[PDB]
């Protein structure tokens, strides 16, 4: 590589919020991120962050069967 134009790559820590730490390389030796592949809901299986809903409507109402048959 040409000299004096490229940011030097050094060994680097990456600390995600989920405690996962990656041993990679970067121009910054230590970086904090809010998410990573180890915890992101698309990555960690069908980790439905909230809406493990199912249908949900238009029948799980069932309030109720009091009308006659």
């Amino acid at each position: 590589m040409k000299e004096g134009i490229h940011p030097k790559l050094v060994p680097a820590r990456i600390i995600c919020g989920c405690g996962n730490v990656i041993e990679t390389y970067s121009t910054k030796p230590e970086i904090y991120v809010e998410v990573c592949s180890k915890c992101h809901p698309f990555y960690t299986g069908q980790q439905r962050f909230v809406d493990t809903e199912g249908r949900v409507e238009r029948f799980q109402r069932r309030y109720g069967d009091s009308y006659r048959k």
Partner: protein
């Protein structure tokens, strides 16, 4: 919306013709003036004519239109814009 303590309202005279069709191998076309009646699941799959004040509108009930009223599907005002 209606209190949950009260029931899911159907005019009873419409609910009856639903089950007689269910318990015999439906369907015949149902004419009705019961805009106020809820679309209970036993109705799913029928086609019912709703009076809008002028015409009885054929409304095919599907699975995703249950917690609703029959009037919502036979609108009353003809409007096509201005100009």
């Amino acid at each position: 919306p209606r209190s949950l303590k009260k029931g899911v309202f159907v005019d009873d005279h419409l609910l009856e013709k639903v089950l007689e069709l269910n318990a015999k191998g439906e369907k015949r076309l149902i004419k009705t003036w019961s805009r106020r009646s809820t679309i209970v699941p036993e109705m799913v799959g029928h086609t019912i004519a709703v009076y809008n004040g002028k015409q009885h509108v054929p409304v095919y009930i599907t699975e995703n239109m249950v917690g609703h009223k029959l009037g919502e599907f036979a609108p009353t005002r003809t409007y096509r814009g201005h100009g």
